[PDB]
Amino acid sequence: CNFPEYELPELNTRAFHVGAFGELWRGRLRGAGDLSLREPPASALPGSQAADSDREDAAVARDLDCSLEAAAELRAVCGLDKLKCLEDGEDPEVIPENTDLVTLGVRKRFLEHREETITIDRACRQETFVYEMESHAIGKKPENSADMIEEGELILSVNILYPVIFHKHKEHKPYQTMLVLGSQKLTQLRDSIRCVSDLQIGGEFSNTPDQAPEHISKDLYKSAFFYFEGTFYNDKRYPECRDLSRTIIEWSESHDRGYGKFQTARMEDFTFNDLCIKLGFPYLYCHQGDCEHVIVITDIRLVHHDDCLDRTLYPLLIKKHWLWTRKCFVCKMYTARWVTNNDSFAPEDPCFFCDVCFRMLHYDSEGNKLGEFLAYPYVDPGTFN
Amino acid sequence: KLFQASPSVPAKYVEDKEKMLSRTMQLVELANETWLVTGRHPLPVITAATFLAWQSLQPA
DNA sequence: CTGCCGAAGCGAGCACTACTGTCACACCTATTTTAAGCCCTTCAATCAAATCATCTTTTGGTTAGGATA
Ligand SMILES: [Zn+2]
Ligand SMILES: [Zn+2]
């Protein structure tokens, strides 16, 4: 049955149907209310539990099959005064010395060698994006009723890798993490992508630099498809969209290329609940016909009242890797906007130029072409990352 | 089977067979007149000559 | 009280490589000696592809040579 298990330790899991998995999760939670989106009561010190005692002791007695006095005794025993070694007025910026923790000892070792004038700072720890996009959306609610997450809705964590891979490291990957709902279709995920592959442009305009093409790649081609468990999900909402998967099925199935039989289907025909997908196992998405993306279902879980309940942000970005700007070779500090080939002035081919370093170098006051070269408008993937 | 663009072989390796034969027969003539072939199996010599040709037409 | 001969349907001849009873002679290997070439293993000396350490080229941020707004 749909019983998640590790195919490999902490790397990937077995395949299961998302809808059946969500139904199983709800069946173990429906009626209990632990999957609800309403704020429940929270634990407190025994000196203030009197107000909540009336509402809590009876339920505790019912669930634990103990007496009301036994429930009160358990509540008094399990009070936070027995656990709160830290008072509520203590700042987290200083290590409490009255401790026996090895973890805090290692923390002290880390902090002591970062207090010198050369080392003391409040800079980034190891990354910044995750908390910034968590606190910006965690615990919030939408301004419109139609943008309400359904109670018990599945939350799927999807990692989309960039087209610019390091091709020098293999442990870590360049990717951005998108959160999607089970009921959502793949169309809303595809339309939410802001990859630079949608912004690609071209054309040789060394003679007339001001005649750059009017239409970006997104305005000329709209082909995009997902690929899960051997199924292609190709967009066809627009005439610019083409079923790219037919060429792949023609090429691959004609020979033993190392992959099995595939099937073709439209992009809007399936929701995230209809997928039978693995977790952690990479999958394929493609758009523009040459921009492939690695798709990893990192995590899946039911919605929680403390999560982002605002659907206007969904698909919600939570994590993102960084790409560095491609800067021109003239001033070696400004991000390039043009690329040239066969350039007599440039020391190397290809050479990257910024608008400032491009126009006045390759043209005079009247804009007349100088020297021999070919020029193309350039969009930096490291900028629009 | 290097004279055909079979799917099992990349097209990078396909060459005109005429130049192939010319290069190979002159290579084996070189081998013959240098006493290499006498008293030995010819087949490996022919294979080696086809090798030197096949690398010579595209060392790139 | 027994017996002859017709009617219709059958048929013919022409159109300038499986075993067995023997039998002797093949098959078979006892070793010698070269002269250049042999197949396979099997390790050792040399090599070159890939990986680690460190100098250095450049991409975000701090400093005090350097500046407007
Ligand atoms: Zn892309
Ligand atoms: Zn410039």
Side-chain angles (χ1 to χ4, degrees):
Chain A
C1 66
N2 295 292
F3 201 80
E5 278 294 354
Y6 279 115
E7 174 178 327
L8 295 172
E10 306 192 340
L11 173 56
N12 48 35
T13 76
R14 285 259 294 126
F16 57 81
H17 189 277
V18 179
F21 174 74
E23 280 304 306
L24 288 161
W25 249 132
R26 286 192 282 261
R28 289 170 175 67
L29 295 167
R30 184 182 289 131
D34 302 333
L35 87 181
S36 178
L37 299 180
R38 296 298 84 168
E39 295 80 1
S43 196
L45 298 167
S48 69
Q49 282 168 358
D52 303 332
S53 67
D54 45 24
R55 299 176 189 179
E56 181 169 323
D57 294 350
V60 166
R62 177 57 271 182
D63 287 351
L64 306 192
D65 313 89
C66 71
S67 71
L68 195 81
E69 183 63 15
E73 178 247 306
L74 291 160
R75 171 168 56 70
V77 166
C78 299
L80 303 186
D81 67 319
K82 317 309 181 198
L83 290 170
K84 277 193 172 191
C85 308
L86 297 169
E87 294 298 336
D88 295 327
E90 302 195 56
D91 297 329
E93 299 282 38
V94 183
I95 291 171
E97 303 94 338
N98 61 339
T99 190
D100 305 343
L101 291 164
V102 179
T103 306
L104 288 185
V106 178
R107 202 92 62 61
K108 185 65 160 169
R109 192 262 287 196
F110 295 162
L111 294 194
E112 282 291 304
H113 81 278
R114 296 196 81 262
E115 300 221 326
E116 307 96 327
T117 61
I118 298 169
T119 63
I120 189 65
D121 51 32
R122 206 169 190 269
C124 183
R125 297 66 51 177
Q126 56 270 345
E127 68 201 333
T128 307
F129 217 79
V130 175
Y131 176 62
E132 298 323 304
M133 275 188 115
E134 277 184 340
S135 59
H136 179 72
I138 195 76
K140 291 194 175 176
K141 291 158 185 168
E143 299 190 335
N144 319 310
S145 62
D147 297 312
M148 191 45 247
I149 310 302
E150 299 185 19
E151 302 203 66
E153 174 61 311
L154 282 163
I155 307 301
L156 282 85
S157 185
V158 185
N159 296 6
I160 305 106
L161 272 69
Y162 310 154
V164 183
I165 301 170
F166 319 137
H167 66 276
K168 276 100 166 192
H169 298 78
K170 200 161 64 182
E171 307 96 293
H172 57 80
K173 314 289 185 297
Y175 70 87
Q176 67 186 328
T177 300
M178 254 306 147
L179 302 183
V180 301
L181 318 178
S183 59
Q184 280 183 319
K185 283 194 173 192
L186 310 184
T187 67
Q188 66 77 44
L189 177 60
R190 176 263 186 212
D191 292 340
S192 78
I193 81 183
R194 299 291 87 154
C195 180
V196 197
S197 308
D198 285 354
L199 313 183
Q200 313 164 340
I201 53 173
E204 203 287 305
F205 294 105
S206 55
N207 283 40
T208 48
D210 302 324
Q211 299 184 337
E214 301 175 68
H215 307 296
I216 59 161
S217 283
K218 208 176 180 64
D219 299 344
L220 298 173
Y221 309 91
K222 300 182 191 293
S223 307
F225 67 83
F226 302 80
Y227 172 83
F228 308 128
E229 60 262 23
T231 316
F232 292 97
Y233 309 95
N234 272 76
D235 194 354
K236 195 38 169 168
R237 294 171 295 166
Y238 310 106
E240 292 78 17
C241 309
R242 296 201 187 107
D243 193 0
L244 297 165
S245 72
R246 79 199 194 291
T247 310
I248 305 311
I249 218 157
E250 285 166 11
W251 167 76
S252 62
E253 296 197 352
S254 66
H255 191 61
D256 227 3
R257 305 209 186 275
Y259 306 96
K261 178 258 187 175
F262 307 136
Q263 49 269 356
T264 63
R266 287 192 170 213
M267 221 268 274
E268 62 264 31
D269 287 348
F270 315 77
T271 63
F272 289 104
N273 283 342
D274 305 309
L275 306 178
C276 190
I277 203 157
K278 294 183 180 187
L279 313 174
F281 188 80
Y283 288 99
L284 167 69
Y285 165 84
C286 182
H287 71 129
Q288 175 57 314
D290 52 20
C291 186
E292 293 169 15
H293 294 165
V294 182
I295 300 299
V296 185
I297 314 303
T298 297
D299 194 18
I300 183 172
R301 62 186 184 76
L302 297 195
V303 66
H304 194 287
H305 84 268
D306 285 320
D307 298 316
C308 177
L309 312 184
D310 187 356
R311 199 172 65 75
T312 67
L313 306 178
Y314 281 75
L316 172 60
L317 179 64
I318 189 156
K319 190 163 185 168
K320 195 176 185 172
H321 273 267
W322 311 306
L323 292 177
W324 306 109
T325 54
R326 182 52 51 199
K327 296 169 173 175
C328 64
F329 203 68
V330 169
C331 52
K332 302 182 166 197
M333 256 313 174
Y334 191 93
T335 307
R337 298 199 197 147
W338 280 81
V339 67
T340 75
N341 301 112
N342 306 75
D343 192 328
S344 67
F345 304 129
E348 297 196 52
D349 190 345
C351 197
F352 280 104
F353 296 88
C354 72
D355 273 357
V356 184
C357 295
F358 176 77
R359 282 178 177 273
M360 56 42 60
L361 174 61
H362 292 114
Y363 312 91
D364 61 8
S365 41
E366 277 65 33
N368 181 31
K369 189 177 174 175
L370 304 175
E372 296 193 319
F373 70 99
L374 304 176
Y376 308 79
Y378 170 76
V379 175
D380 176 30
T383 287
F384 295 84
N385 162 279
Chain B
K1 71 199 298 179
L2 305 317
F3 308 149
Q4 56 270 53
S6 172
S8 192
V9 296
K12 302 172 183 177
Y13 309 139
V14 179
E15 289 295 355
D16 180 6
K17 77 181 181 73
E18 177 273 326
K19 59 188 189 186
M20 202 56 28
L21 309 211
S22 53
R23 190 63 55 81
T24 46
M25 63 46 54
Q26 60 195 168
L27 283 169
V28 287
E29 181 264 12
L30 201 34
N32 154 88
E33 64 93 344
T34 52
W35 309 85
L36 294 175
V37 312
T38 307
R40 292 156 171 191
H41 273 187
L43 151 64
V45 173
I46 320 316
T47 306
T50 55
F51 252 68
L52 330 170
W54 192 89
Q55 339 311 311
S56 74
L57 294 323
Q58 192 207 31

